[PDB]
Symmetry: C3
């Protein structure tokens, strides 16, 4: 396309679409209920991502936001995706450790705040206000990572898998507020082409990457 970032949105689409097929196919073979749960969640995540990367690729989820001087291109389909897939990932972590209903509530709620404010700054028109919405969104991410460390004696083919996935999450999720800040969505110090490349490498890793590690573990069984 006439857009420099098409290549990464094209590669994003393929990879997400590839992970869903692999996981669905892999998904075929399960009988253990609990294990079913982890396939249902893990497969839907890139399934959703698949639909939003295509929408950006065909250009449906792209808008112009006016701010800091001129008109700015902003992929909003990114947040609609994150809106559903991140709560879906925390749910994988949550049911892995037999979380409490109460803690599952807080995580999900804080998550919706995270993305929700992230979307608000993405579409905000006053340049300065954006980073205030960024701060709050970041403040919720700190809560979530906090909770999965200090508020989150279980069987060991579980614990060890959880510590692994959680390390992945914390490192990946932490990159997103950094990319957004340096990117076109935030400081504008990095062009849209690179900002799109960064998110795609995170998304595939945090989704397909995360799912592969997960759906192989014996942790997901009885």
């Amino acid at each position: 396309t006439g857009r420099p970032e098409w290549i990464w949105l094209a590669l994003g689409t393929a990879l997400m679409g590839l992970g869903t097929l692999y996981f669905l196919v892999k998904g075929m073979g399960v009988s253990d209920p609990d294990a079913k749960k982890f396939y249902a969640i893990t497969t839907l995540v890139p399934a959703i991502a698949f639909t939003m990367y295509l929408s950006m690729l065909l250009g449906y989820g792209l808008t112009m936001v006016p701010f800091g001087g001129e008109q700015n291109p902003i992929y909003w389909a990114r947040y609609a995706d994150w809106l559903f897939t991140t709560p879906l990932l925390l749910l994988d972590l949550a049911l892995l450790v037999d979380a409490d209903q109460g803690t599952i509530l807080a995580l999900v709620g804080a998550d919706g705040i995270m993305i929700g404010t992230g979307l608000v700054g993405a579409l905000t028109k006053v340049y300065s206000y954006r980073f205030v919405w960024w701060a709050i969104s970041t403040a919720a991410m700190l809560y979530i990572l906090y909770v999965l460390f200090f508020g989150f004696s279980m069987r060991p083919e579980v614990a060890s898998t959880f510590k692994v996935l959680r390390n992945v999450t914390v490192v990946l999720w932490s990159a997103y507020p950094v990319v957004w800040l340096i990117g076109s969505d935030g400081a504008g110090i990095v062009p849209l082409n690179i900002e799109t490349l960064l998110f795609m490498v995170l998304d595939v890793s945090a989704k397909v990457g995360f799912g592969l590690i997960l759906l192989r573990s014996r942790a997901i069984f009885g």
Copy 2:
């Protein structure tokens, strides 16, 4: 109104509104918890449909989408409805057969993809791209119907009711991708007047029709 399809949107509103009253009234008389569940779900479905048919009737959920040459009228309130009521129907089927949490997750997730992509093609501006979003949406419908047949020894006043409702669903739900394709939302081979007539006959049948069959069955009790 100045719109040819008012009559069907007017009849849609009455019928949906009539089913909700009947089901709520009928709903009054229940004590068995589990049965309560099926009244809660079954009544809310046309309740929601009721609100969206009126919005189309008063014209709040109507927009113009430019594509394939000219400006196209598109009722988007239809998808906001389907967004909530179809997961509500699968939930009726799901709890009827004591589905697994895992399978309830997949159905609902695939459903949101179905409608979600359906909405995206409805609002897409490049004529050709629409049917690509149609294909994917259809691909999710095939998953759902699949699952309720091959991934979905239970008491017989249940099994027989389930096979019935499920037959209804498969036949009705299959009509929707056909109507959308021939209709104004898709191929434009059928005018908006007829496309509105078709969806109304499906909606009332899949909702009120489906609910009547359901809320009479002894299957919904202990």
Copy 3:
């Protein structure tokens, strides 16, 4: 700001932000699972409200709706908030009395209808149609309050707390359809400045006020 209602949206933001901090901090100290549940829900409610009051304050959730003659200012961020926080409050009441899944479904569903139609009239362009959407929205509020009285033998440090919270709810929630009618969103008999003052006093009371009463009760424990 250049807006007369800034002061109340500024005071709304502070107070909601203050309640969340207090509840989170207070939240630190819990071990009993069930009690955790009530902190998770109760704290997220003003957390969300916090984000939407700021959005109105910075002016992100403000739009112009044309009707009854001229252009009308309409804070839509108010409904996105109510969209999530009112179901969150009913859930506090619901789990307080060990509600049935079925009844929890009806309450939440009716609630989404309430706000959902409320939003539709807020954005409707034909003056008269607004109050029709107001009527239906009100009709759902009557269902909810009904249900929490006649469809909602439990331990007494519970029952007495429930009767209390419920009295709060009914009196507060009943004020909202009145404010909306006399306000700029409805009849226009009260200016936006006063209508914004009224909602802020209700919101803080129904949220922070409601939460304080709740998170002190021994009802929330085992």
